[PDB]
Design an enzyme around this catalytic site. Structure first.
Site, short mmCIF file in Angstrom:
data_model
loop_
_atom_site.label_atom_id
_atom_site.label_comp_id
_atom_site.label_asym_id
_atom_site.label_seq_id
_atom_site.Cartn_x
_atom_site.Cartn_y
_atom_site.Cartn_z
N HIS A 67 2.76 -14.91 0.12
CA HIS A 67 3.52 -14.18 1.34
C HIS A 67 2.38 -13.81 2.22
O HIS A 67 2.35 -14.07 3.44
CB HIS A 67 4.02 -12.97 0.64
CG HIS A 67 5.05 -12.94 -0.33
ND1 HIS A 67 6.32 -13.68 -0.27
CD2 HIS A 67 5.15 -12.58 -1.61
CE1 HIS A 67 7.01 -13.71 -1.41
NE2 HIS A 67 6.45 -12.93 -2.21
N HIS A 103 -4.00 -5.83 3.55
CA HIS A 103 -3.50 -7.06 3.87
C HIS A 103 -3.07 -7.19 5.31
O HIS A 103 -3.21 -6.45 6.21
CB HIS A 103 -2.21 -7.46 3.21
CG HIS A 103 -0.90 -6.49 3.37
ND1 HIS A 103 -0.85 -5.51 2.81
CD2 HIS A 103 -0.18 -6.79 4.36
CE1 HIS A 103 0.08 -4.73 3.09
NE2 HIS A 103 0.62 -5.46 4.22
N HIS A 163 -0.28 -9.33 8.40
CA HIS A 163 0.83 -10.09 8.99
C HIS A 163 0.38 -10.88 10.24
O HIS A 163 -0.26 -10.17 10.93
CB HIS A 163 1.98 -9.27 8.94
CG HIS A 163 2.17 -8.47 7.84
ND1 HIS A 163 3.15 -8.78 7.01
CD2 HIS A 163 1.88 -7.32 7.59
CE1 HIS A 163 3.29 -7.90 6.17
NE2 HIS A 163 2.65 -6.88 6.42
N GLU A 178 4.01 -6.67 13.41
CA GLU A 178 4.97 -6.11 13.05
C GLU A 178 5.59 -5.05 13.61
O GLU A 178 6.87 -4.85 14.22
CB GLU A 178 5.11 -5.56 11.31
CG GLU A 178 5.02 -6.83 10.36
CD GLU A 178 5.36 -6.64 8.80
OE1 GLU A 178 4.71 -5.62 8.39
OE2 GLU A 178 5.95 -7.44 8.28
N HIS A 184 -2.63 -3.67 7.54
CA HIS A 184 -2.09 -2.77 7.08
C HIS A 184 -3.07 -2.42 5.82
O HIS A 184 -3.14 -2.94 4.65
CB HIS A 184 -0.87 -3.35 6.15
CG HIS A 184 0.28 -3.25 7.20
ND1 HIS A 184 1.50 -3.77 7.14
CD2 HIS A 184 0.38 -2.90 8.66
CE1 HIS A 184 2.10 -3.82 8.19
NE2 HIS A 184 1.57 -3.30 9.27
N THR A 190 7.30 -2.91 4.24
CA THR A 190 7.88 -4.00 5.17
C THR A 190 8.16 -5.48 4.58
O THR A 190 8.53 -6.20 5.11
CB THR A 190 7.02 -4.27 6.57
OG1 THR A 190 5.75 -4.74 6.04
CG2 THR A 190 6.71 -3.03 7.24
N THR A 191 7.82 -5.39 3.23
CA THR A 191 8.33 -6.44 2.35
C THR A 191 9.17 -5.99 1.49
O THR A 191 9.08 -4.77 0.94
CB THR A 191 7.00 -7.31 1.76
OG1 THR A 191 6.51 -6.61 0.48
CG2 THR A 191 6.30 -7.66 2.74
C1 LIG Z 1 6.46 -2.34 -6.63
O1 LIG Z 1 6.26 -3.34 -5.78
C2 LIG Z 1 5.71 -3.54 -4.48
C3 LIG Z 1 5.56 -4.65 -3.90
C4 LIG Z 1 4.95 -4.49 -2.63
C5 LIG Z 1 4.67 -3.54 -2.10
C6 LIG Z 1 3.99 -3.34 -0.72
C7 LIG Z 1 2.72 -2.60 -0.61
C8 LIG Z 1 4.77 -3.81 0.18
C9 LIG Z 1 4.26 -4.06 1.71
O2 LIG Z 1 3.34 -4.11 2.12
O3 LIG Z 1 5.44 -3.53 2.46
C10 LIG Z 1 4.77 -2.05 -2.72
C11 LIG Z 1 5.39 -2.15 -4.10
ZN LIG Z 2 2.20 -5.09 5.54
#
Ligand SMILES: COc1ccc(/C(C)=C/C(=O)O)cc1
Ligand SMILES: [Zn+2]
Length: 258
Positions: free
Chosen positions: A62, A92, A94, A104, A117, A196-197
């Site tokens: 991703h 990370h 986007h 985003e 982020h 956001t994921t």
């Molecule tokens: C519990 O699993 C998770 C998976 C992803 C994330 C994040 C930190 C997602 C994002 O950046 O939107 C958190 C928990």
């Molecule tokens: Zn993000």
């Protein structure tokens, strides 16, 4: 779960496995600079990254995550809208297929080339997995990227991407200093929102800096050479891994600055 960013598994699909996708505090959102109100009660923001211990970089299919040792208070975010102490766990980005899209959050409907982020969790909940179950569990610091001059503090990241091209690949990534990714100003907007994921949990205090950082076209081009696919699978370039703006609903965006 088999979510992604394509036509068949992208953001318009997420709600079937993750119904909170249509919830009341989803992110990202459009930041309307003429409606966000300055809030004098905001305390100043404290970014304490001197003792940061980065460990590893991972292509998760991703994006790519730069991961930190969060077993003690080594790199923390405090102040601003936050109560207590939030530990940096990962950062990370986007980004887009073209320089005109990728972020985003948007600013008066303006899309940036990318968005960084920096993800932190509230140490009062003891671990990350407990924190994402709490409405004040996470603080994500969001930073816009525009294409211009090179960001020197980003180049160590860009140069390791060849080694994590495909999904599931990781590389050692020690001694990386996340201070090198910050703009000059810590002026910000803040609002309550979500991951956001998937799993899209409603656990984030968003803190979005007003000042973008500049990165070079060559830097962002290297992000676009990553792959969503695993090794030996049909090549799908990792681009356009951003969720679009979601309804603001019953929320107010606050500004730290006049
Ligand atoms: C519990 O699993 C998770 C998976 C992803 C994330 C994040 C930190 C997602 C994002 O950046 O939107 C958190 C928990
Ligand atoms: Zn993000």
């Amino acid at each position: 779960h088999h979510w992604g960013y394509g036509k068949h598994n992208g953001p318009e699909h997420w709600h079937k496995d993750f119904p909170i996708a249509k919830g009341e505090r989803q992110s990202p959102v459009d930041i309307d600079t003429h409606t966000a109100k300055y809030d004098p009660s905001l305390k100043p923001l404290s970014v304490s990254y001197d003792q940061a211990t980065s460990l590893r970089i991972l292509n998760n299919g991703h994006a790519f995550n730069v991961e930190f040792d969060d077993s003690q208070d080594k790199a923390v975010l405090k102040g601003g809208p936050l109560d207590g102490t939030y530990r940096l766990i990962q950062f990370h980005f986007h980004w887009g297929s073209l320089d005109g899209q990728g972020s985003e959050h948007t600013v008066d409907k303006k899309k940036y080339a990318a968005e960084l982020h920096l993800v932190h969790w509230n140490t009062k909940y003891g671990d990350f997995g407990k924190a994402v179950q709490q409405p004040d569990g996470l603080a994500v610091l969001g930073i816009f990227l525009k294409v211009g001059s090179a960001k020197p503090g980003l180049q160590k990241v860009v140069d390791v991407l060849d080694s994590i091209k495909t999904k599931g690949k990781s590389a050692d990534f020690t001694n990386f200093d996340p201070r090198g990714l910050l703009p000059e100003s810590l002026d910000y907007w803040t609002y309550p929102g979500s991951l956001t994921t998937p799993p899209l949990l409603e656990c984030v205090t968003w803190i979005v800096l007003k000042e973008p950082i500049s990165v070079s076209s060559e830097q962002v081009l290297k992000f676009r050479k990553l792959n969503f696919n695993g090794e030996g699978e049909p090549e799908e370039l990792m681009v356009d891994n951003w969720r679009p703006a979601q309804p603001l609903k019953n929320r107010q965006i606050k500004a730290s600055f006049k």
